Design an enzyme around this catalytic site. Sequence first.
Site, short mmCIF file in Angstrom:
data_model
loop_
_atom_site.label_atom_id
_atom_site.label_comp_id
_atom_site.label_asym_id
_atom_site.label_seq_id
_atom_site.Cartn_x
_atom_site.Cartn_y
_atom_site.Cartn_z
N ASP A 12 -2.63 41.23 44.17
CA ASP A 12 -2.53 40.39 42.59
C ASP A 12 -1.40 41.18 41.97
O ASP A 12 -1.47 42.54 41.43
CB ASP A 12 -3.56 41.01 41.82
CG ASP A 12 -3.48 40.44 40.52
OD1 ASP A 12 -2.67 39.74 40.10
OD2 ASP A 12 -4.53 40.81 39.88
N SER B 265 12.49 32.33 32.90
CA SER B 265 12.98 31.16 33.50
C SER B 265 14.01 30.33 32.48
O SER B 265 13.78 30.59 31.50
CB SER B 265 11.96 30.42 33.72
OG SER B 265 12.17 28.92 34.35
C1 LIG Z 1 -1.53 39.60 28.04
C2 LIG Z 1 -2.35 38.95 28.37
C3 LIG Z 1 -2.76 38.98 29.70
N1 LIG Z 1 -3.99 37.95 29.84
C4 LIG Z 1 -5.19 38.80 30.18
C5 LIG Z 1 -3.74 37.11 30.76
C6 LIG Z 1 -3.41 37.84 32.00
N2 LIG Z 1 -4.29 37.81 33.31
C7 LIG Z 1 -3.82 38.51 34.27
C8 LIG Z 1 -4.69 38.51 35.60
O1 LIG Z 1 -5.82 39.26 34.95
C9 LIG Z 1 -4.03 39.63 36.70
N3 LIG Z 1 -3.59 38.63 37.53
C10 LIG Z 1 -4.69 37.38 37.46
C11 LIG Z 1 -5.88 37.47 38.53
N4 LIG Z 1 -7.18 37.11 38.34
C12 LIG Z 1 -7.78 37.53 39.42
C13 LIG Z 1 -9.12 37.45 39.96
C14 LIG Z 1 -9.89 37.09 38.76
C15 LIG Z 1 -11.26 36.60 39.07
C16 LIG Z 1 -11.70 36.42 40.56
C17 LIG Z 1 -12.83 36.05 40.93
F1 LIG Z 1 -13.18 34.70 40.33
F2 LIG Z 1 -13.14 36.23 42.18
F3 LIG Z 1 -13.73 36.85 39.99
C18 LIG Z 1 -10.70 36.78 41.57
C19 LIG Z 1 -9.41 37.25 41.10
N5 LIG Z 1 -7.02 38.48 40.19
O2 LIG Z 1 -5.86 38.38 39.44
C20 LIG Z 1 -5.36 37.56 36.37
C21 LIG Z 1 -2.57 39.01 34.25
S1 LIG Z 1 -1.90 38.26 32.76
#
Ligand SMILES: C=CCN(C)Cc1nc([C@]2(O)CN[C@@H](c3nc(-c4ccc(C(F)(F)F)cc4)no3)C2)cs1
Length: 330
Positions: free
Chosen positions: A35, A199
Amino acid sequence: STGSATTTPIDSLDDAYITPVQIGTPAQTLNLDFDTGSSDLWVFSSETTASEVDGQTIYTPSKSTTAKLLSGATWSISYGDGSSSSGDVYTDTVSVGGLTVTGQAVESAKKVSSSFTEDSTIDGLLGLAFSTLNTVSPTQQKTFFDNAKASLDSPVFTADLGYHAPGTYNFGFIDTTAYTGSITYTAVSTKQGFWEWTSTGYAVGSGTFKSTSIDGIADTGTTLLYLPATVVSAYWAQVSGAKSSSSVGGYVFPCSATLPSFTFGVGSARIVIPGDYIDFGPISTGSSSCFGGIQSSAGIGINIFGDVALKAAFVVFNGATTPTLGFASK
Ligand SMILES: C=CCN(C)Cc1nc([C@]2(O)CN[C@@H](c3nc(-c4ccc(C(F)(F)F)cc4)no3)C2)cs1
């Protein structure tokens, strides 16, 4: 040193990609979601609440001769989809594709949210954003890449994700056979702890390119491409019957449609996402409404170049003193 490991989609939609990681001595192999949008290496473990484990492979530190409790350290993280996990911390030897870090922080889950429990294919996450986002308290910990960096031949890793097919994560070198043309590098801001870049614009299908700056993050842990509502509306306007559905949670389109491609700018270069990459299939089994792979970032607060975008390119995460991102077609 270098490492090279194959990454494989967890399902027929490329919802996420898992990469085998060796932890401990003797090795315990767990399939982790790499990730670049977070900075914690955490695993299902022998400490995870039993009712919250459903088919995952667990890390058992008591069976590793190299595991050491990182006394007093805890962690707790939530992701953009609302999922979360938390627990305590061990240090142990971690190897990815032949590259070994001794003393890596391995965050052992005591609790995971339902979405993790429900995904039996993902045994944990390996964060590759900047270590400033790591959640371990009271002593923040470094990512696997940050720990390996000084030992690598070059302070880089690359993501070469497949469309409905396996791909590769390499550490420490650039595989010049893995892409076509040249790699265009672009500046990274680390101020939010992400691989954040700008971008230079976009095109829809065969349309003319619209020059416009789009700040966003390169995030292998996010499935879809999240862009400003203006851009996303211009894309879906080209698909007969496509609409934003409040009940589904985003743009859907008739499964009978053939989707246009979407091009994004990297400096003066262009990455073309084929229309098929934007099709995420029926919203539910048997439905003729399909879920779009380009969605609005409105209310996320940040644009996210997730797997839909990254799997159309060979992507270089350059962690030199001045970090940059490279994109090539492939
Ligand atoms: C400033 C605002 C940020 N706001 C929170 C939006 C963002 N969010 C991210 C992530 O949190 C990191 N990169 C993504 C990610 N999601 C997962 C993941 C989640 C759930 C599962 C499950 F379904 F199995 F539970 C599996 C993998 N892994 O990475 C999301 C970066 S910016």
